[PDB]
Amino acid sequence: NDLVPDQWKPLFNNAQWLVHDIVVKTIYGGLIIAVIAHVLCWAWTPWIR
Amino acid sequence: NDLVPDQWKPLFNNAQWLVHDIVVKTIYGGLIIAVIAHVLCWAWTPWIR
Amino acid sequence: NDLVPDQWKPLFNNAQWLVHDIVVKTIYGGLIIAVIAHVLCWAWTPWIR
Amino acid sequence: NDLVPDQWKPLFNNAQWLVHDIVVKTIYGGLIIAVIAHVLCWAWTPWIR
Amino acid sequence: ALPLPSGETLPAASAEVIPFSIIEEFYKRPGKTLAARFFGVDPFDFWIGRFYVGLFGAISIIGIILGVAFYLYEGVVNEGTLNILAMRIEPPPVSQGLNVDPAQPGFFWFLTMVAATIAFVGWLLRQIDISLKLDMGMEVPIAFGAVVSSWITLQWLRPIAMGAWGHGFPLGITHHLDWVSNIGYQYYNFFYNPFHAIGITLLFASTLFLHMHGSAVLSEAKRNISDQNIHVFWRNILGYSIGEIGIHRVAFWTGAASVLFSNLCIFLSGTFVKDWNAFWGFWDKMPIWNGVGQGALVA
Amino acid sequence: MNWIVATFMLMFVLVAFLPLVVSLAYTWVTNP
Amino acid sequence: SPWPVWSGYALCFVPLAAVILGFIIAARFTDKQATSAYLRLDPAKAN
Amino acid sequence: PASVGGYQITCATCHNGKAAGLEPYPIEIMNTLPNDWRLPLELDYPGGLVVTGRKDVSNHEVEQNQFAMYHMNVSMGQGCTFCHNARYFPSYEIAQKNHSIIMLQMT
Amino acid sequence: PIDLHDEEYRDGLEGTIAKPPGHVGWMQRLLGEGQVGPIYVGLWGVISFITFFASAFIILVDYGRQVGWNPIIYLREFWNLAVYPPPTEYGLSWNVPWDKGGAWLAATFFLHISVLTWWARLYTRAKATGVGTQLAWGFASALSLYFVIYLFHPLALGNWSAAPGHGFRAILDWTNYVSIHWGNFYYNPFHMLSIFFLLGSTLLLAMHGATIVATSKWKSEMEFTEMMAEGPGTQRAQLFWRWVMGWNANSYNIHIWAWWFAAFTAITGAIGLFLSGTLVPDWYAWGETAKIVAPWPNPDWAQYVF
Amino acid sequence: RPFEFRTSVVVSTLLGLVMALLIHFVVLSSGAFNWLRA
Amino acid sequence: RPFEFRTSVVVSTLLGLVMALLIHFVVLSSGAFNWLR
Amino acid sequence: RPFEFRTSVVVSTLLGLVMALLIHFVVLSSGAFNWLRA
Amino acid sequence: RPFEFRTSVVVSTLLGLVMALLIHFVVLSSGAFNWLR
Amino acid sequence: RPFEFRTSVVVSTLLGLVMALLIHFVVLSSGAFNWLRA
Amino acid sequence: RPFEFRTSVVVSTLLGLVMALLIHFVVLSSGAFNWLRA
Amino acid sequence: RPFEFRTSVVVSTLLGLVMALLIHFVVLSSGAFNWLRA
Amino acid sequence: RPFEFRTSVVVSTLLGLVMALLIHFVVLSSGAFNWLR
Amino acid sequence: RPFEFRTSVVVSTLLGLVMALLIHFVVLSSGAFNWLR
Amino acid sequence: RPFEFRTSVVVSTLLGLVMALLIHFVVLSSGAFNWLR
Amino acid sequence: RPFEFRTSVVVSTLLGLVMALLIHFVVLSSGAFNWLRA
Ligand code: BCL
Ligand code: BCL
Ligand code: BCL
Ligand code: BCL
Ligand code: BCL
Ligand code: BCL
Ligand code: BCL
Ligand code: BCL
Ligand code: BCL
Ligand code: HEM
Ligand SMILES: [Fe+3]
Structure with missing residues (x-):
């Protein structure tokens, strides 16, 4: 756990930090795309009325 | 893992790097082809209207 | 693995290289025949319209 | 089996005598209540006629 | 390297590499069949190839040959179909009764059914003899006897009890299904027959038990384990392990019980009952709830 | 319906049930 | 029209022949493995 | 046809010895069915209760068909094969199914 | 490398309960x-x-609501109560009243999640005990049939009504209704194959159980030990089945035979059920066109009348 | 002794409970007392 | 002692809960009190 | 200590997810909000 | 002690959740409050 | 530690896939969006 | 000798008895003799 | 010796008896001879 | 040798007998000879 | 490492193939494109 | 080597025989050639 | 290496053959090509 920050050393391993970063970046990209898709769908036709 | 880059050494093997690279190129070609196919299909007949 | 190139030595064996070459050539010929057949069928009867 | 009477020693334990007494008292109370309830219900509506 | 029964080749117990010929020769021990006890001698007490032929082996083979000949004759001749998926081998008409006449149609159905019954009983007795020669138990004969009793119920007891003898099944491929369908819909909701439901439950349980036992035994064949891993695995999931000897007992019992209840339901449906929906009319009239409802919730 | 013959055939069926019951009883009597 | 349809051909007669051949082949190889020579306990000593 | 006989309909056919208070759908015949089921007399019976391979209906229509069919069974005492061959229900071969068509139109 | 005492006597989550065994x-x-x-x-x-x-x-509360919350009637009509899917109108929609199929969808969803998590449990415990994972794939082959019945068949037909109604008597009704709708499954070839495999499975189970019990005087039930070296009981069983029908197996092949019978039963059943409605609307007509239906001009119908 | 106290207690209590429930249900269904809306 | 405290507590609690539920359901279903419409 | 953090977290997460799904299903089926369908 | 803290907590939580869900379902089904249409 | 990274990843991925499939099916089967011929 | 005397005796007696029973049954079933009202 | 004498005798006897039974039954059922009531 | 005399004799005899029975039955079924009524 | 390359490859390939087949069949059965008549 | 000669020969022969029989039967049943009446 | 040559070859061959048969069936069943008597 050389690369793990001091705060999260008891919970994380050096190999797991990289996979965690990849997962977080994927989630943030997916959230942005989902927000855009929801905005376009609402502009197309509202679902609440 | 001599040919593996320094950053990704703890996660990858020497033989796994080549297979991963092949899969990455395959995914990139498939994505380009799928984008083209979707554009032509939309130009032919919209599915949302 | 004497006949295998340097790049693919960890992945391939001297015996598997020849069979891989055979398979690659077979797939190339199959793709050529498939393209010709598809062009002929399109010339005969279009399926998209 | 100090508390168990002489006749009932071969069947009962010292601990089961008290539970048997409790069960007997409960059954006697239940029979008294049942007799009262049956008399009340007969005074309300005869079920033989 | 020592070859294991599974197929492993493990480099090196009191075991040794023994050909099957020695075992086959050692365990012959002629002269202990059922017919030998009765008559003092078995007329056929030898082997023809890998098979053992006894007194009842001859009877079984005669029945098999005669039944196959009669079956082919009724279906190739007298029908002129020439294919086996369109043959329709019928018993005599219900009007004829319990009597048999060679001139009237349906006689070769009688011949085939009698020959098949003889062959089945001969096979059962041959199994008993082979079991008795090896000093084994009589479990396989019990299971097969359950199956043979299932046959006898359908082809002998029900037609005699109903008394017209046209109530037995045609022996045709894809055509006994027609008889099953018509009989099942004549007594409508054959699902609602209790013994049919018990038999279906036992059949499904038998299949599930077979799959579970096969998986459990196959999951430990070629591994370095201590023989107690399977017990811990079966106690961690479902919290119970039956053991080695209990699973086979359960299998045999479930298999026999399914067929027994099935033949019971078929016979009972034939004669003592007419409708399986009317059989349940007693339920709602019992004097614990016959007065508690209103409107559609009455009864 | 002749009810004597039907009851006889039913008795034969219940007899056919017997061998499994005998096997169960034998297994219970042994293994004490 | 003395012949069945193509769907009948496939759905009926391909699985039937497949089942028959598979059963015969599996029985033959099971018997071959069963009758081979491997470790066994000697019947003379074993009781 | 004359095979059935020549029986006629009279007062006792429907009344059966009662002046009034007739009971169509009594409780004893409503055994397996829902207690508020009635015959669907708003349909065209030459094709009213057809379900085989329709592909525009589902299990609910089959359930309604089964209710009607069991009612037809109970009203007689001959079981489901009286008018049908169980190998193929759509078949018209038993000769009491056309009689049932005429009866349905009459009802 | 696996300690059975630990795998059987841990505490807390990732452990065991009911630790003092019963008898x-x-x-x-x-x-x-x-x-x-x-x-x-x-x-x-x-x-x-x-x-x-x-x-x-959910199902039990709907049962209670259907009887007016009367416990006596609840006991009266328990075995003929059901929670049916939405009617044929509004085929695959979820905007349905709770009493018109709303509860069925939720219950079915939770049941799907439950069965998938049970498969995961089986797989993980097989891995953690050191044994193979054959049971997981057998359960997968049965879940294939289950998912064809409950999910994949109602889809591609266009309605939820093609699924069972969650009741003791509702499964029997579903079987009868599906048989009547699509002709006759007696002429479905995959129904025939499934029946063949099912009856073969029952036959094989009975034979194996009887064979092992008959030779149990020589410790033939210890399958794990017999796979290392054959004993007198296995030898007697092999000789018996060789002298009866001319061929036999050892104490290792029979388990492969049983596993594949059960797997084929499940898979063929699933394929037949899926193929029943989408491609062949009438099985009897298909059988007639395939020449697998026997001619039947002049029946004797007196057998089938009371 | 032929029977233990525990088994006797269990059997007696179960029999009493089942009999009480059965009698109450039968009397309710009989409709002969005008109890709980007739 | 013939019975443990644990068993007695468990049986009594289950019996009481079941009886209370049954009595409430019977009273609600009878429709003789004008409660909950 | 009576319970581990793992058991509490798992039970709480599962209960929350199941409750949310059930409430959403019931609200959708009631049809009292004019949402996702007329 | 006859019972442990873990068992009591588990049983109480399950009983409370089951009772609350049952009461909400009965109240909703009764149709006597004008709730959710 | 309480939970492994593997278990969290597996549960999160499976839950996301299941929820995506269910939401797509519910939204598209509602017939309120006019997607692929109404 | 290929066969023993007692084995031949058993086989011959059993075959003769079976054939006699079969012939009486077939003749009776034919109904061509007016025997037992036939 | 390729075969034993007893096997040959037994097989021949079985085949002959089966053939005789089959031929008599076929000829009786064909009704082409006027034997045993036509 | 690959095949024994006994196996060849058995296979040949069984095949011949089965073929003779099949041919006689088919010829009888065809009804093209005016044989046996 | 938490996950091996082989398992990820297998799961990705299976998911992709299943999704491709499902989407093709859904689009074909929708009948909104005039494809294959 | 990855595969042995016997396996290749067996698979090829089985596939060829199956495809040949299937194609002849499909062509015969199609009734588009005027073959065998 | 993550995967052996045999596994790749077997999976590829099976997938190709199954896909070819399925595509031929789906194309020829549609009746939109006029092949082999319509
Ligand atoms: C209304 C008039 C009805 C009728 C209605 C009922 C009903 C209703 C019941 C009986 C019961 C009985 N009836 Mg009456 N019965 C009728 C006519 C008859 C006739 C007759 C010839 O006509 C006879 C012989 C009987 C005879 C009997 C007995 C078998 C029995 C009562 C005695 C008993 O067992 O006490 C022994 C009983 C006990 C020891 C019970 C003790 C229970 C204890 C006291 C606990 C009570 C609950 C309390 C809340 C617990 C609280 C504490 C917590 C547990 C911590 N009935 C008519 C038709 N009868 C009762 C019975 O017990 O049936 C099994 C019963 O429930
Ligand atoms: C409204 C009039 C109704 C009727 C409605 C009801 C209802 C409704 C109930 C009873 C109950 C009972 N009825 Mg009444 N009952 C009627 C007529 C009768 C007649 C008769 C001859 O007419 C009789 C003999 C009885 C007899 C009885 C008893 C068996 C019992 C009450 C005593 C008891 O068990 O106390 C002992 C009870 C206790 C010790 C309860 C203690 C509960 C503790 C305090 C917990 C309470 C809940 C609280 C929220 C907990 C919170 C904290 C959390 C645990 C963390 N009823 C009529 C028809 N009756 C009740 C019962 O319990 O039946 C089994 C019951 O539910
Ligand atoms: C529309 C009006 C409806 C209604 C619709 C709903 C719906 C729909 C829901 C609720 C929910 C709840 N309702 Mg409300 N509700 C109504 C009327 C009521 C009434 C009342 C007496 O009138 C009451 C008391 C309540 C009470 C409640 C609570 C029990 C609960 C909200 C608090 C909570 O638990 O937060 C605790 C909740 C959380 C801590 C959630 C945290 C979630 C985290 C942030 C993740 C979110 C997902 C996100 C995509 C994750 C992204 C990253 C990836 C994981 C990588 N409702 C009316 C009838 N109500 C909700 C519920 O049950 O929640 C469990 C719910 O779903
Ligand atoms: C019918 C008229 C009213 C109505 C009338 C009432 C009334 C009256 C009441 C409620 C109450 C409640 N109502 Mg309501 N309610 C209505 C409509 C709603 C709607 C809706 C969708 O419309 C919702 C979501 C709710 C929701 C709720 C809850 C917030 C609450 C009950 C909580 C509960 O389950 O406690 C039971 C829960 C438990 C026993 C579990 C607790 C678990 C804790 C919180 C978490 C940790 C668990 C721990 C880790 C476990 C450890 C052990 C494990 C074994 C490891 N109401 C309508 C509008 N509602 C009740 C209330 O106020 O409660 C406070 C109440 O009395
Ligand atoms: C059209 C408008 C519809 C509707 C249609 C949908 C549909 C359809 C979906 C959602 C989804 C979601 N909806 Mg919406 N939704 C509506 C109204 C709402 C409302 C509301 C009004 O209150 C809310 C609160 C939400 C909330 C939500 C979220 C839970 C979620 C989107 C964010 C998210 O989780 O991102 C977190 C998501 C991610 C991190 C995913 C990232 C995935 C990455 C990008 C890979 C994707 C797969 C791709 C094929 C990969 C290709 C390469 C290969 C891997 C090699 N919806 C209305 C009714 N909504 C989506 C969802 O995810 O549901 C679970 C979804 O599928
Ligand atoms: C009625 C005219 C019928 C007909 C009716 C029958 C009948 C009936 C039978 C034959 C049989 C045969 N038929 Mg012719 N047959 C017909 C037309 C033909 C035609 C033809 C081209 O038309 C041919 C080629 C044949 C050919 C044959 C032979 C296969 C065979 C007779 C020879 C034989 O086996 O000798 C070799 C025979 C033996 C060596 C038998 C020896 C038996 C010993 C002597 C014992 C006799 C029994 C005695 C009771 C024993 C007592 C023992 C006690 C201890 C005392 N049939 C017509 C259609 N045929 C017979 C046969 O054997 O079929 C298998 C037979 O049963
Ligand atoms: C009537 C004209 C019918 C017809 C009716 C039959 C019938 C009926 C039969 C044949 C049989 C055969 N047919 Mg032709 N057949 C026809 C047209 C043809 C045509 C053609 C293209 O037209 C061909 C190629 C053939 C060809 C053949 C042969 C395959 C075969 C005869 C030779 C053989 O194999 O002997 C090999 C056989 C032997 C060497 C047997 C020797 C048996 C010994 C002599 C013992 C006999 C039994 C003995 C008496 C029993 C008692 C023993 C005791 C110890 C006493 N047939 C027409 C349509 N054909 C026969 C056959 O055997 O088929 C397998 C047969 O049964
Ligand atoms: C519907 C309109 C057209 C039509 C349109 C097309 C089009 C368009 C194409 C075809 C293609 C093909 N068509 Mg078409 N086709 C028509 C009518 C027909 C008819 C017919 C009787 O009418 C036939 C028989 C065929 C036949 C064929 C094949 C020759 C070919 C696909 C082969 C294949 O499976 O590749 C897949 C096979 C494999 C992946 C397996 C290969 C195995 C090798 C050969 C052997 C390996 C052995 C070794 C031991 C194995 C080792 C591994 C083992 C696991 C141990 N077509 C109609 C008239 N057809 C395709 C083509 O041309 O392909 C080149 C194509 O694209
Ligand atoms: C009538 C016109 C029909 C049609 C009828 C048939 C029939 C019928 C057959 C084919 C066959 C084939 N068809 Mg074409 N076919 C049609 C249209 C097509 C179209 C198209 C796009 O239109 C295509 C691409 C094809 C393609 C193909 C090939 C896949 C194949 C031939 C090559 C091959 O594999 O040889 C490889 C084959 C061999 C090497 C066989 C060698 C056999 C040896 C010589 C032995 C023969 C048997 C002999 C008796 C042995 C005797 C001695 C003993 C061994 C001791 N067909 C049309 C619709 N086609 C044949 C095939 O093989 O299908 C699987 C086949 O049977
Ligand atoms: C017994 C319970 C029973 C069953 C089952 C049954 C089935 C059935 C079906 C499936 C149909 C329709 C199938 C189709 O595609 O047409 C159908 C139709 C009719 N039946 Fe029926 N039937 C059962 C019982 C009976 C009985 C006892 C009779 C005669 C009184 C009878 C008759 C009819 C008639 C008439 C029809 C035609 C319905 C119509 O055309 O609308 N059925 N049955
Ligand atoms: Fe075993």
């Missing part, structure tokens, strides 16, 4: 073992428990 007695006399023993709970099984009991609670 039944009569199961020890009749079956040879009567230890109730501890049971594992490891986050694959808590989810199954919660989801299955949520589904059961």
